[PDB]
Scaffold this active site. Structure first.
Site, PDB file in Angstrom:
ATOM      1  N   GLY A  16       0.775  -0.800  -0.316  1.00 28.45           N
ATOM      2  CA  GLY A  16       0.148   0.047   0.316  1.00 28.45           C
ATOM      3  C   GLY A  16       1.169   1.299   0.223  1.00 28.45           C
ATOM      4  O   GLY A  16       2.409   1.522  -0.200  1.00 28.45           O
ATOM      5  N   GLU A  88      10.770  -6.064  10.383  1.00 25.69           N
ATOM      6  CA  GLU A  88      10.049  -7.086  10.587  1.00 25.69           C
ATOM      7  C   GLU A  88       8.556  -7.229   9.651  1.00 25.69           C
ATOM      8  O   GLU A  88       7.880  -6.301   9.812  1.00 25.69           O
ATOM      9  CB  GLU A  88      10.261  -7.810  11.643  1.00 25.69           C
ATOM     10  CG  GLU A  88       9.454  -7.038  12.742  1.00 25.69           C
ATOM     11  CD  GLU A  88       9.075  -8.165  14.029  1.00 25.69           C
ATOM     12  OE1 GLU A  88       9.250  -8.612  14.331  1.00 25.69           O
ATOM     13  OE2 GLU A  88       9.871  -6.691  15.629  1.00 25.69           O
ATOM     14  N   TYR A  89       8.901  -8.604   9.011  1.00 16.34           N
ATOM     15  CA  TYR A  89       7.114  -8.148   8.781  1.00 16.34           C
ATOM     16  C   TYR A  89       6.235  -9.153   9.870  1.00 16.34           C
ATOM     17  O   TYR A  89       6.714  -9.851  10.377  1.00 16.34           O
ATOM     18  CB  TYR A  89       7.643 -10.095   7.631  1.00 16.34           C
ATOM     19  CG  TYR A  89       6.338  -9.871   6.711  1.00 16.34           C
ATOM     20  CD1 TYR A  89       5.512  -9.206   5.586  1.00 16.34           C
ATOM     21  CD2 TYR A  89       5.823 -11.557   6.373  1.00 16.34           C
ATOM     22  CE1 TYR A  89       4.694  -9.005   4.657  1.00 16.34           C
ATOM     23  CE2 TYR A  89       4.542 -11.882   5.697  1.00 16.34           C
ATOM     24  CZ  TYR A  89       3.841 -10.393   5.076  1.00 16.34           C
ATOM     25  OH  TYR A  89       2.545 -11.001   4.077  1.00 16.34           O
ATOM     26  N   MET A  90       5.306  -8.546   9.214  1.00 17.52           N
ATOM     27  CA  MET A  90       3.712  -8.727  10.781  1.00 17.52           C
ATOM     28  C   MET A  90       3.141  -8.934   8.799  1.00 17.52           C
ATOM     29  O   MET A  90       1.843  -8.347   9.016  1.00 17.52           O
ATOM     30  CB  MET A  90       3.738  -7.789  11.106  1.00 17.52           C
ATOM     31  CG  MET A  90       4.554  -7.044  11.604  1.00 17.52           C
ATOM     32  SD  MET A  90       4.880  -8.436  13.286  1.00 17.52           S
ATOM     33  CE  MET A  90       4.377  -7.595  14.538  1.00 17.52           C
ATOM     34  N   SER A  94      -2.402  -4.156  10.910  1.00 19.22           N
ATOM     35  CA  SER A  94      -2.817  -3.457  11.932  1.00 19.22           C
ATOM     36  C   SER A  94      -4.159  -3.731  13.046  1.00 19.22           C
ATOM     37  O   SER A  94      -5.025  -5.127  11.836  1.00 19.22           O
ATOM     38  CB  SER A  94      -2.718  -2.021  11.257  1.00 19.22           C
ATOM     39  OG  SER A  94      -4.116  -2.026  10.713  1.00 19.22           O
ATOM     40  N   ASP A 134       0.689   7.834  20.947  1.00 17.56           N
ATOM     41  CA  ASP A 134      -0.327   7.375  19.492  1.00 17.56           C
ATOM     42  C   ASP A 134      -0.388   5.814  20.041  1.00 17.56           C
ATOM     43  O   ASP A 134      -1.229   5.472  19.240  1.00 17.56           O
ATOM     44  CB  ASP A 134       0.132   8.142  18.625  1.00 17.56           C
ATOM     45  CG  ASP A 134      -0.823   7.595  17.515  1.00 17.56           C
ATOM     46  OD1 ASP A 134      -1.517   7.951  17.801  1.00 17.56           O
ATOM     47  OD2 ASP A 134      -0.236   8.282  15.883  1.00 17.56           O
ATOM     48  N   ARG A 138      -5.279   0.464  16.249  1.00 21.92           N
ATOM     49  CA  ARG A 138      -4.454   0.883  14.328  1.00 21.92           C
ATOM     50  C   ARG A 138      -2.683   1.017  14.658  1.00 21.92           C
ATOM     51  O   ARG A 138      -2.130   0.577  13.618  1.00 21.92           O
ATOM     52  CB  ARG A 138      -4.765   2.161  13.827  1.00 21.92           C
ATOM     53  CG  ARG A 138      -4.742   3.344  14.785  1.00 21.92           C
ATOM     54  CD  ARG A 138      -5.190   4.215  14.328  1.00 21.92           C
ATOM     55  NE  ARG A 138      -4.529   5.839  14.498  1.00 21.92           N
ATOM     56  CZ  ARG A 138      -5.027   6.107  16.739  1.00 21.92           C
ATOM     57  NH1 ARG A 138      -5.946   5.503  16.471  1.00 21.92           N
ATOM     58  NH2 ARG A 138      -4.916   6.968  16.603  1.00 21.92           N
ATOM     59  N   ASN A 139      -2.250   1.359  15.759  1.00 22.09           N
ATOM     60  CA  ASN A 139      -0.841   1.339  15.024  1.00 22.09           C
ATOM     61  C   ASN A 139       0.255  -0.117  16.100  1.00 22.09           C
ATOM     62  O   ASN A 139       1.084   0.239  16.299  1.00 22.09           O
ATOM     63  CB  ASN A 139      -0.534   2.495  16.382  1.00 22.09           C
ATOM     64  CG  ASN A 139      -0.189   3.928  15.596  1.00 22.09           C
ATOM     65  OD1 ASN A 139      -0.689   4.099  14.187  1.00 22.09           O
ATOM     66  ND2 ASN A 139      -0.950   4.983  16.290  1.00 22.09           N
ATOM     67  N   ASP A 152       4.902   2.673  14.898  1.00 24.58           N
ATOM     68  CA  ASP A 152       4.185   4.199  14.157  1.00 24.58           C
ATOM     69  C   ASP A 152       4.594   5.348  15.673  1.00 24.58           C
ATOM     70  O   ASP A 152       4.084   5.901  16.895  1.00 24.58           O
ATOM     71  CB  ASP A 152       2.943   4.432  14.255  1.00 24.58           C
ATOM     72  CG  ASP A 152       2.137   5.620  13.681  1.00 24.58           C
ATOM     73  OD1 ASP A 152       3.189   6.107  14.020  1.00 24.58           O
ATOM     74  OD2 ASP A 152       1.781   5.058  12.660  1.00 24.58           O
TER      75      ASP A 152
END
Ligand SMILES: [Cl-]
Ligand SMILES: [Cl-]
Length: 272
Positions: A16, A88-90, A94, A134, A138-139, A152
Site C-alpha cells: 500500500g 520485520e514482516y507482520m 494492523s 499515539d 491501529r498502531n 508508529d
C-alpha cells in the site's frame, strides 16, 4: 541505525501507500546468508530534505528498542536510492483492521495473549523513557503467529488522537507514561470489542466532556469482569492511581495462568 546493502533487499509486492511513499513487502538477506521476510518502506522520489529527515527520524526512534513486542528495525538504506526503511514482516497487518475481519472468532485467552504482548512492549518503551502518545490498536501490528508489536513512532517523544488520549494530556498536554497507560486501556477496549472505534462517532467535544464528567466506555459484549475492571483502572481520572505497565503485564500473566478467572463475565452509550 544499521545501513543495509541494497543488494540484500528484494521487493516482492507493494502492500500500500504510506505518508512518505510506498509500503512494500520483500526479503532481506542477512550477513549470515539467512533470508527473512521484511516490510520495506520507500521514500518517494523527489523527496524534500524535511521528508527525508522525518522519514529516517522515525526509523531512528524505532531503532532504540530491541524487544519482542516492539517492531524490529532491520536497518535503513541511505547510501543508494530510493531511501528505504526495513522492518520485520507482520503478516496480519494492523490489529484493529485484523480484529474487525474476525469478530467473535478468537478465544478470550488468545485475546489476552495479544494484550499481554502489547503491555510488555509498552513496559519496555516506558522503561526507556519514551512516551508513545499515539498508542492505539491501529498502531499495533500482528504477525502470522498473532504476536502483537508496538509500531508508529511518529508521535513518540523522549520524556492529537482525542479518543486515545488521557484527560490531562487533552487538557494541558501532560504526557507521561501514565497517559500511555490510559491509551492502553483504550486499546484493551478495542481488542475486546474486535476493533470497534472508541466512542464510535461522538463529537470530539462530547468525548472530552463525557470522560471528564466521569463517563466511560461500556463493557464489550461478553467481556470478562477482570478485563473490564482493568480498563476502568487504566481510566482513573487521577494518573497516579493508574497501574504501571509492569503491573498490567503481571495482571494479564495471572489471567493466562488460570483461564478460569476469565469465565467471570461483566454484567452503545457511556456508563457513569
Ligand atoms: Cl546489508
Ligand atoms: Cl480522535
Amino acid at each position: 541505525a544499521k545501513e543495509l546493502d541494497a543488494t540484500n533487499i528484494s521487493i516482492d509486492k507493494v502492500v500500500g501507500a504510506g505518508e512518505f511513499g510506498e509500503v512494500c513487502s520483500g526479503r532481506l538477506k542477512l550477513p549470515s546468508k539467512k533470508e527473512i521476510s521484511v516490510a520495506i518502506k520507500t521514500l518517494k522520489v523527489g523527496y524534500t530534505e524535511k521528508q527525508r529527515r522525518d522519514f529516517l527520524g522515525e526509523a531512528s526512534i524505532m531503532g532504540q528498542f530491541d524487544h519482542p513486542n516492539i517492531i524490529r528495525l532491520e536497518g535503513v538504506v541511505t547510501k543508494s536510492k530510493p531511501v528505504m526503511i526495513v522492518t520485520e514482516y507482520m503478516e496480519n497487518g494492523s490489529l484493529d483492521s485484523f480484529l474487525r475481519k474476525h469478530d467473535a472468532q478468537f478465544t478470550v485467552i488468545q485475546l489476552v495473549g495479544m494484550l499481554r504482548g502489547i503491555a510488555s512492549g509498552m513496559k519496555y518503551l516506558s522503561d526507556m523513557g519514551y512516551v508513545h502518545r499515539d498508542l492505539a490498536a491501529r498502531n499495533i501490528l500482528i504477525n502470522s503467529n498473532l504476536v502483537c508489536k508496538v509500531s508508529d513512532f511518529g508521535l513518540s517523544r523522549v520524556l492529537i488522537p482525542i479518543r486515545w488520549t488521557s484527560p490531562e494530556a487533552i487538557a494541558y498536554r501532560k504526557f507521561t507514561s501514565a497517559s500511555d497507560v490510559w491509551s492502553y486501556g483504550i486499546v484493551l477496549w478495542e481488542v475486546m470489542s474486535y476493533g470497534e472505534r472508541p466512542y464510535w462517532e461522538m463529537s470530539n467535544q462530547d468525548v472530552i466532556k463525557a470522560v471528564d464528567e466521569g463517563y466511560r466506555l461500556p463493557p464489550p459484549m461478553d467481556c470478562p469482569a477482570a478485563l473490564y475492571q482493568l480498563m476502568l483502572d487504566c481510566w482513573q481520572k487521577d494518573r497516579n492511581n493508574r497501574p504501571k505497565f509492569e503491573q498490567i503485564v503481571s495482571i494479564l500473566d495471572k489471567l493466562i495462568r488460570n483461564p478460569g478467572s476469565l469465565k467471570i463475565i461483566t454484567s452503545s452509550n457511556l456508563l457513569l
